[PDB]
Amino acid sequence: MNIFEMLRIDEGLRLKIYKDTEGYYTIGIGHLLTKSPSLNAAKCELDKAIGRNTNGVITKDEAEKLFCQDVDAAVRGILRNAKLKPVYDSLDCVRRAALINMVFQMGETGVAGFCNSLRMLQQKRWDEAAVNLAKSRWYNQTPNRAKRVITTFRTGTWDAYKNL
Ligand code: NA
Ligand code: NA
Ligand code: NA
């Protein structure tokens, strides 16, 4: 298991524009196009992201290319963030993937504000951090995904992604 396979499990793969769990136009492996309610706006975002007139449909290779970019943008945003970088730097490779997953889903700004959960992760108080992370809108709105990510932080293993 690795960050690509992990996010592929959590985000799925769809080749036509769809609405994500928040109702926002998305394509591929969780590539958010726009928060605008306009499908036309989403289509402009898509054609711009792919570099051609897509008519709302892409190939698997194109989806994987956006995913390459999006995973790196999650990492780059962690490293540029004064609250997230020290946590990321303190973590092992598996738990780093859990943090990347959170940032991919919710954005740098939101995760960076979880000052108690971040402190507990930095302190390597894994069970405490896991309890604290579950006191979140994130956990309540996407509990199965959050449980997998939280188990990854709690254990430092990929056990929650086995058989998926
Ligand atoms: Na545009
Ligand atoms: Na940043
Ligand atoms: Na603990």
Author numbering: 1 to 164
Structure paper excerpt:
After immersing the cross-linked crystals into a precipitant-free solution containing 50 mM phosphate buffer at pH7, 0.2 M NaCl, and 30% (v/v) glycerol, the X-ray diffraction data were collected under a cold nitrogen gas stream at 100 K. The diffraction patterns were indexed in the space group P3221 with cell constants of a = b = 60.0 Å and c = 97.1 Å, where one of the six independent molecules is contained within the asymmetric unit. The unit cell volume was slightly smaller than those of non-treated crystals of TA (a = b = 61.5 Å and c = 95.9 Å) and another TA-T26H mutant (a = b = 61.5 Å and c = 97.7 Å). The structure refinement at 1.10 Å resolution converged to crystallographic R work/R free values of 14.8/16.8%. In the unit cell, one independent molecule forms a trimer unit with two neighboring molecules through intermolecular disulfide bonds, Cys44−Cys115’ and Cys115−Cys44’, respectively. The chemical oxidation time of a week was enough to complete the disulfide formation over all molecules in the crystal. These disulfide bond lengths are estimated as both 2.05 Å based on the electron densities of cysteine sulfur atoms. One trimer is further connected to another trimer through two disulfide bonds, Cys68−Cys93’ and Cys93−Cys68’, with each bond length of 2.03 Å. These bond lengths correspond to the typical disulfide bond length. Although there are no large conformational differences between the structures, the small displacements of main-chain atoms are seen at the residues behind Cys44 and before Cys115, which could be caused by the formation of intermolecular disulfide bonds, Cys44−Cys115’ and Cys115−Cys44’.
